[PDB]
Write a protein that binds this DNA or RNA. Sequence first.
RNA 1: CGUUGACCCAGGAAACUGGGCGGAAGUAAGGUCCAUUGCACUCCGGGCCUGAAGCAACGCG
Length: 94
Amino acid sequence: ETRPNHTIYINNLNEKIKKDELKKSLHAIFSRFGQILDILVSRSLKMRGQAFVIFKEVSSATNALRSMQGFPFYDKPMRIQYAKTDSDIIAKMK
RNA sequence: CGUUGACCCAGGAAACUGGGCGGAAGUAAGGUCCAUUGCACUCCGGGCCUGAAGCAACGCG
Ligand SMILES: NC(=O)CC[C@H](N)C(=O)O
Ligand SMILES: [Cs+]
Ligand SMILES: [Cs+]
Ligand SMILES: [Cs+]
Ligand SMILES: [K+]
Ligand SMILES: [K+]
Ligand SMILES: [K+]
Ligand SMILES: [K+]
Ligand SMILES: [Mg+2]
Ligand SMILES: [Mg+2]
Ligand SMILES: [Mg+2]
Ligand SMILES: [Mg+2]
Ligand SMILES: [Mg+2]
Ligand SMILES: [Mg+2]
């Protein structure tokens, strides 16, 4: 939401983009900010235009957040929040 | 779809078994047109057009 999460929630994503290449482009732009646990993207009716990237450390998520906030990606301005709830791996990876 | 195999994973002392992995399907995916600004982590909106593939080989449609 607005409380620092390992995982950022991105939206206003250009839905015209194919799935894997939407990752590929996302994973590159963001891996700069730190180790990246995974990137989830569905093009379903209600999951499209949105991506979850999960970082190892919280600080990576935080830095990725404000730095990239509101920038144009594929001709559309990203909106970034902290994700409302922790991504699954965070537990599973224990 | 069948047979004989490769490789990964789970179980098993093992033999092997299951999945990954085939005619799958007008599915995935692609173009367009509509509709959606959507908080998820076991697919998964609709129309038209186009349209695949198991990892290898052979056999069969
Ligand atoms: N998809 C398939 O069933 C492939 C069969 C084909 N005859 C082959 O040997 O590869
Ligand atoms: Cs085994
Ligand atoms: Cs198999
Ligand atoms: Cs469509
Ligand atoms: K048996
Ligand atoms: K098989
Ligand atoms: K088969
Ligand atoms: K399409
Ligand atoms: Mg064993
Ligand atoms: Mg087997
Ligand atoms: Mg077989
Ligand atoms: Mg489709
Ligand atoms: Mg259709
Ligand atoms: Mg073949």
